[PDB]
Amino acid sequence: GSHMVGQLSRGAIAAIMQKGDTNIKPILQVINIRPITTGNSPPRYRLLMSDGLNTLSSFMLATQLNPLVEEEQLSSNCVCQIHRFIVNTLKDGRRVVILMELEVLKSAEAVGVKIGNPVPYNE
Numbered sequence: 001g002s003h004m005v006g007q008l009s010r011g012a013i014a015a016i017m018q019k020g021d022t023n024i025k026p027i028l029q030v031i032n033i034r035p036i037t038t039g040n041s042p043p044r045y046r047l048l049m050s051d052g053l054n055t056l057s058s059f060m061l062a063t064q065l066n067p068l069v070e071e072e073q074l075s076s077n078c079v080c081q082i083h084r085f086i087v088n089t090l091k092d093g094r095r096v097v098i099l100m101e102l103e104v105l106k107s108a109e110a111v112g113v114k115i116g117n118p119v120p121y122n123e
């Protein structure tokens, strides 16, 4: 409804990246999804997600969630609640968020636009 950005967990991206808050179950919007160059493994999907305030491109789907993308329930513009995730840190210091369980609250067709004007999270 009205006040669309009120549907999203504003501040969750900063909470995840800094505090390392993991007990939260934030509601985020999918902005973009794309497959990763994998080789001969099942595909991996990388997601650009928004909390209304920030976007962050360092999300990856657990392979068990691949059917959500492949059967088109999880697509750009949909709004999801993250129920389980972990943060990992690469050798170079970059952090990545692995989404393990999520729920689609509103399909892409029911939302239809990028909500608000989120800006890229820095670090």
Ligand SMILES: O=C(O)c1ccc(-c2ccc(C(=S)NCc3ccc(-c4ccnn4-c4ccc(Cl)c(Cl)c4)cc3)c(Cl)c2)o1
Binding pocket: 036, 037, 046, 057, 058, 059, 060, 061, 062, 063, 064, 088, 089, 090, 094, 095, 096, 097, 098
């Ligand atoms: O069920 C499962 O699939 C499951 C359970 C636990 C895990 C799981 C555990 C650890 C990892 C990690 S950080 N692998 C490191 C990894 C690092 C880079 C990559 C990777 C390959 C191409 N791009 N790219 C990349 C680079 C930068 C960022 Cl910010 C992102 Cl989001 C992706 C691919 C993998 C990943 Cl990807 C998944 O997966």
